[PDB]
Amino acid sequence: PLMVKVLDAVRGSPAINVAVHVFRKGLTTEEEFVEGIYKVEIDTKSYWKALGISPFHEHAEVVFTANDSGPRRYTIAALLSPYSYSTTAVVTN
Amino acid sequence: PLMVKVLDAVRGSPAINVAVHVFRKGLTTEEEFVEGIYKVEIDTKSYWKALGISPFHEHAEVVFTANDSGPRRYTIAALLSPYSYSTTAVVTN
Amino acid sequence: PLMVKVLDAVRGSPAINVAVHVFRKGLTTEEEFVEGIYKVEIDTKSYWKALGISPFHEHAEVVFTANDSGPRRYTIAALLSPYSYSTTAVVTN
Amino acid sequence: PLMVKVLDAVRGSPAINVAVHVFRKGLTTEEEFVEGIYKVEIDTKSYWKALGISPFHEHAEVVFTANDSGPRRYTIAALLSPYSYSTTAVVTN
Amino acid sequence: PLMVKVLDAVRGSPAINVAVHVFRKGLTTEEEFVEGIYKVEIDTKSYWKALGISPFHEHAEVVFTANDSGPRRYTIAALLSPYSYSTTAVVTN
């Protein structure tokens, strides 16, 4: 006998993010998993990954260069931060 | 006997994001999984990935260059942040 | 016996995003999965991927260049952030 | 015996996005999956993908250049953010 | 007999992020796991990863350079920090 109760009774006006998981029971492998439920990614970069089998196996001449030299402005008042009866703002002048 | 109850009773005007998962029971592989439910991606970049088998196997001359040198402005008042009886705003001048 | 109850009773005017999943039981492979339910992607880029088998196998001369050097403005007051009895706005001058 | 109940009773004028999934039980492969339910994509780009078998196999001379250098303005007051008895707006001057 | 109760009764207008997990019971491998529930990633970069089997096996000449030399401003008033009856703001002049 398994019983799960979440927020069974609520009165008012909340601000909520919820996540509920229940469970009874090659080069890159992944199995029987949960990922990236409330995930957030910003300026996330992956240059090389899982190129493959026998790459650049013989007499390979390679030049790898990576430049992230840029003017970038990321502004976020609230991130994964629910709020209630409050005040949020972003202002620039 | 499995019972799950979420937000069974609510009174008012909330602001909610919900996620409920229940469960009874090659080069790149993935199996029996959940991903990217409430995921968010911004400026997310993947240059090379899973090119394949035997790439650049023999006498490969390669020049890899990556430049992210740009003026970019990402402004987000609320991200995955539900709200109630509140005030949000983005202002520029 | 499996029972799932979500938001069984509601009174008022909420603002909700819901996701409910229930379950009883080659180069790139994917099987028996859920993905991208409430996903969001902005400025998401993938230059090379899964090119194929034996690419650039022999005497390959390659020049790879990537430039993201641009004026871009992404403005988002609310993202995956439902709200109630509130006020949101985007203003520019 | 499997029973699922969602929003069984509602009184008022909410604002809702819902997703319910129930389930009893080559180069690129995908099987038995759900994807892109409430997905959103903006400025999403994929230059090369799944070119094929034996591409550029022999003596291939290649020049790859990618430029995203443009004036672009993406403005979104509400994204996957339902709301109720509220006020949203986008203003420019 | 297993019973779990969370936020069974609530009165008011809170601001909440919730995560509940319950459970009864190749080069890179992952199995039977949960990851990235409320994860956040900013300026997260992975240059090389899981290149593959026998890469640069013989007489490989390689030049790897990585430059993160850029003007970048990341401003975040609230991150995974829900709030209530409060005031948050981002201001620039």
Side-chain angles (χ1 to χ4, degrees):
Chain A
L2 193 162
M3 184 175 284
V4 178
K5 296 177 72 173
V6 187
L7 292 158
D8 186 73
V10 168
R11 193 179 188 192
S13 63
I16 314 185
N17 292 320
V18 182
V20 185
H21 164 102
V22 184
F23 189 13
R24 288 180 67 97
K25 184 178 172 69
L27 199 79
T28 286
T29 301
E30 277 167 304
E31 204 156 314
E32 290 268 312
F33 79 89
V34 182
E35 181 175 359
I37 304 108
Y38 277 85
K39 179 163 215 160
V40 180
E41 302 192 9
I42 306 185
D43 208 19
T44 305
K45 56 185 79 68
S46 163
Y47 295 81
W48 285 12
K49 185 176 179 180
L51 300 182
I53 299 166
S54 68
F56 305 99
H57 195 279
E58 298 178 354
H59 297 287
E61 178 146 33
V62 175
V63 186
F64 186 99
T65 314
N67 295 289
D68 296 331
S69 298
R72 314 219 273 279
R73 296 187 170 158
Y74 297 170
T75 302
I76 313 186
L79 196 153
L80 270 169
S81 302
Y83 48 99
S84 79
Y85 286 91
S86 64
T87 303
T88 187
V90 173
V91 184
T92 291
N93 296 291
Chain B
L2 193 162
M3 184 175 284
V4 178
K5 296 177 72 173
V6 187
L7 292 158
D8 185 73
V10 168
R11 193 179 188 192
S13 63
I16 314 185
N17 292 320
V18 182
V20 185
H21 164 102
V22 184
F23 189 13
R24 288 180 67 97
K25 184 178 172 69
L27 199 79
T28 286
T29 301
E30 277 167 304
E31 204 156 314
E32 290 268 312
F33 79 89
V34 182
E35 181 175 359
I37 304 108
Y38 277 85
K39 179 163 215 160
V40 180
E41 302 192 9
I42 306 185
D43 208 19
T44 305
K45 56 185 79 68
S46 163
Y47 295 81
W48 285 12
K49 185 176 179 180
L51 300 182
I53 299 166
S54 68
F56 305 99
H57 195 279
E58 298 178 354
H59 297 287
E61 178 146 33
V62 175
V63 186
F64 186 99
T65 314
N67 295 289
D68 297 331
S69 298
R72 314 219 274 279
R73 296 187 170 158
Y74 297 169
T75 302
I76 313 186
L79 196 154
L80 270 169
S81 302
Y83 48 99
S84 79
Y85 286 91
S86 64
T87 303
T88 187
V90 173
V91 184
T92 291
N93 296 291
Chain C
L2 193 162
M3 184 175 284
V4 178
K5 296 177 72 173
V6 188
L7 292 158
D8 185 73
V10 168
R11 193 179 188 192
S13 63
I16 314 185
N17 292 320
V18 182
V20 184
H21 164 102
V22 184
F23 189 13
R24 288 180 67 97
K25 184 178 172 70
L27 199 79
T28 286
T29 301
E30 277 167 304
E31 204 156 314
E32 290 268 312
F33 79 89
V34 182
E35 181 175 359
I37 304 108
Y38 277 85
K39 179 163 215 160
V40 181
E41 302 192 9
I42 306 185
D43 208 19
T44 305
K45 56 185 79 68
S46 163
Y47 295 81
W48 285 12
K49 185 176 179 180
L51 300 182
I53 299 166
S54 68
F56 305 99
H57 195 279
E58 298 178 354
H59 297 287
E61 178 146 33
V62 175
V63 186
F64 186 99
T65 314
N67 295 289
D68 296 331
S69 298
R72 314 219 273 279
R73 296 187 170 158
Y74 297 169
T75 302
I76 313 186
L79 196 154
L80 270 169
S81 302
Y83 48 99
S84 79
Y85 286 91
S86 64
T87 303
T88 187
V90 173
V91 184
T92 291
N93 296 291
Chain D
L2 193 162
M3 184 175 284
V4 178
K5 296 177 72 173
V6 188
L7 292 158
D8 185 73
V10 168
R11 193 179 188 192
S13 63
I16 314 185
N17 291 320
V18 182
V20 185
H21 164 102
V22 184
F23 189 13
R24 288 180 67 97
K25 184 178 172 70
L27 199 79
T28 286
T29 301
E30 277 167 304
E31 204 156 314
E32 290 268 312
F33 79 89
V34 182
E35 181 175 359
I37 304 108
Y38 277 85
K39 179 163 215 160
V40 180
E41 302 192 9
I42 306 185
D43 208 19
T44 305
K45 56 185 79 68
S46 163
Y47 295 81
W48 285 12
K49 185 176 179 180
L51 300 182
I53 299 166
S54 68
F56 305 99
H57 195 279
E58 298 178 354
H59 297 287
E61 178 146 33
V62 175
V63 186
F64 186 99
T65 314
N67 295 289
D68 297 331
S69 298
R72 314 219 273 279
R73 296 187 170 158
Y74 297 169
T75 302
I76 313 186
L79 196 154
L80 270 169
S81 302
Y83 48 99
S84 79
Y85 286 91
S86 64
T87 303
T88 187
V90 173
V91 184
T92 291
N93 296 291
Chain E
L2 193 162
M3 184 175 284
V4 178
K5 296 177 72 173
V6 187
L7 292 158
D8 185 73
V10 168
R11 193 179 188 192
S13 63
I16 314 185
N17 292 320
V18 182
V20 185
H21 164 102
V22 184
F23 189 13
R24 288 180 67 97
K25 184 178 172 69
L27 199 79
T28 286
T29 301
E30 277 167 304
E31 204 156 314
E32 290 268 312
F33 79 89
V34 182
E35 181 175 359
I37 304 108
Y38 277 85
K39 179 163 215 160
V40 180
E41 302 192 9
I42 306 185
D43 208 19
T44 305
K45 56 185 79 68
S46 163
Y47 295 81
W48 285 12
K49 185 176 179 180
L51 300 182
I53 299 166
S54 68
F56 305 99
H57 195 279
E58 298 178 354
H59 297 287
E61 178 146 33
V62 175
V63 186
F64 186 99
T65 314
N67 295 289
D68 297 331
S69 298
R72 314 219 274 279
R73 296 187 170 158
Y74 297 169
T75 301
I76 313 186
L79 196 153
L80 270 169
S81 302
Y83 48 99
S84 79
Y85 286 91
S86 64
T87 303
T88 188
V90 173
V91 184
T92 291
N93 296 291

